[PDB]
Symmetry: T
Subunit: 64 residues, 12 copies
């Protein structure tokens, strides 16, 4: 059985790096991370000092 968690990573550099940011966090806390699916992308402008790229991923991990 696989389970997915819905995470939004951030980066000041790129959409790829923002996806990596989410996956890194998943790997900090979860065992057996197997894949991530991009489900949304966007950019925060008017709340931050530098544009911040956001990539939302479903991160799948194997249970047991």
């Amino acid at each position: 059985v696989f389970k997915k968690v819905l995470l939004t990573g951030t980066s000041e550099e790129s959409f790829t790096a923002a996806a990596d940011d989410a996956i890194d966090r998943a790997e900090d806390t979860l065992d057996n991370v197997v894949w991530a699916e991009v489900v949304d992308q966007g950019v925060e402008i008017g709340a931050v000092e530098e544009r911040t790229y956001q990539t939302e991923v479903q991160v799948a991990f194997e249970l047991d």
Copy 2:
């Protein structure tokens, strides 16, 4: 990094109040709740005494 939980709130009054019901529950248990996105709405009729409005939200919270 943000994480989302998928919650369905209920209310006997309105769709807005049903969204609030989910957000209230998230805030009981989670720190740093930042936003909610409505993803579905419906009404339970033939299981309850009074019509029950349901609003399903992805509730986003900041990790750390």
Copy 3:
């Protein structure tokens, strides 16, 4: 077996009341109404005297 009818309710007050308007009509004519799913919402402005909220629902009822 359940069947659904696709109804658009109207209200001069709210989206919730417009959903109720459709469900009320279903219950006038059908037995065993069990649930409604919101599928669209909108507002009529330039055909009516007062803004009219519209909520479109699939209304499910049990056959037999």
Copy 4:
């Protein structure tokens, strides 16, 4: 010919009132507003003092 503008209204009270907030703004600036279609709903929590309901609408108006 109709044209649509994509507006997000806000309210501290309800999703219906947030839709009205967008439509009111359209009517301030545009002639012949005829209808609005809800395309998204959400709630701002962690940037404001009170929860703020957001309703995004395509607001249609007749040209000429």
Copy 5:
């Protein structure tokens, strides 16, 4: 309030059995499981000895 977890069940037999596999896991760990919604189906071929059917479900459970 209901919460959903996003699980992918597997089976060497059928899509129905793969859905059951996810629901079984949810029921091992959660109280008050009430319903599951199928959101995706697929088949793993080139990583396994026998074709493996996958059915992804949102599994809803009642909180409290």
Copy 6:
């Protein structure tokens, strides 16, 4: 001209059998049933004695 009715069939056995359950009901009442399109699948757990598979189909039939 074809018309479609939106039916949800149920089965304690499988998603295929639940689709058949809806089609059987359509054929009880309608002439010239020609095809069915699956539009949703799910499982009822916390209202029934045994898990109940649901398959929702648009059932098309030829008019005249």
Copy 7:
């Protein structure tokens, strides 16, 4: 309250004429037809003597 029926019209000439074919049938049987929304289009080739254009419409009519 409005209700919609899901009809597929056919024509050997065009997608527009196929939509008209469905609307014509609705108007044969229903009072107060107000609008139609195109939801699908296709072409039957390998069952007919001439290509047959199909346009599927939700046809809305006012109740009462």
Copy 8:
């Protein structure tokens, strides 16, 4: 950079002519119109003397 405007053209003749009606209006007012994407089609029946075909297009034009 390209920008899109969301226009609904109308015609008493066809869906193609309704798309043209929107594009014609865009070209009246905008320079460097490059393409249009159909996003919706429908028919107005119960507000007009003759059925009126509507085709909604995103009309893209090049900035500068």
Copy 9:
């Protein structure tokens, strides 16, 4: 077993004729073409001498 090819037909006349243009090409090369499903429509303006209607179809054909 059926297979589909994803083709975009073009016409200077109409969306229907653009669909036909794709189907004609499929029939030049493939046996047992059975149906086509429209999946997108658009108009090329700023690359051609005359507006060019495009209709994208999945064209299904029977294998063997």
Copy 10:
């Protein structure tokens, strides 16, 4: 690099068997088939002697 082919399998028994029917055909002709994604399901009724389940899959295979 992976490529996908869009195939509809058929079966008189089940949706799972119809998916298998498509995958079997892919494996007859292609090397390195790795996975299949279900994209549609339906039932043919009014053209065949027995109901025929159809499952449409994108079948992915590795190039080289």
Copy 11:
């Protein structure tokens, strides 16, 4: 109230840079740009000297 404009940015380097290209243009002309949502991505090949990445964004800005 927020308003969105639908812009397609271009870059010879990356999808991230193409999003930035659109946002830069919005910021040239608009005050109070707050966020951008990616809605499409693609690559122009057969009209340009070098592959050109395109990222389409809804760019939101606060009115007043």
Copy 12:
């Protein structure tokens, strides 16, 4: 007439490079490649030594 092939490119570096990987393969084998549309993005983690970015594109090419 245009045709599209559905390809998934891979890269250890970025989503942009993964799109390029698919387009490069198309250009190895096909004449008159004109454009690519991104339809999915994801990351393989638990099958490879280094995270592998995947970008799925419909690659369009002109026939004849």
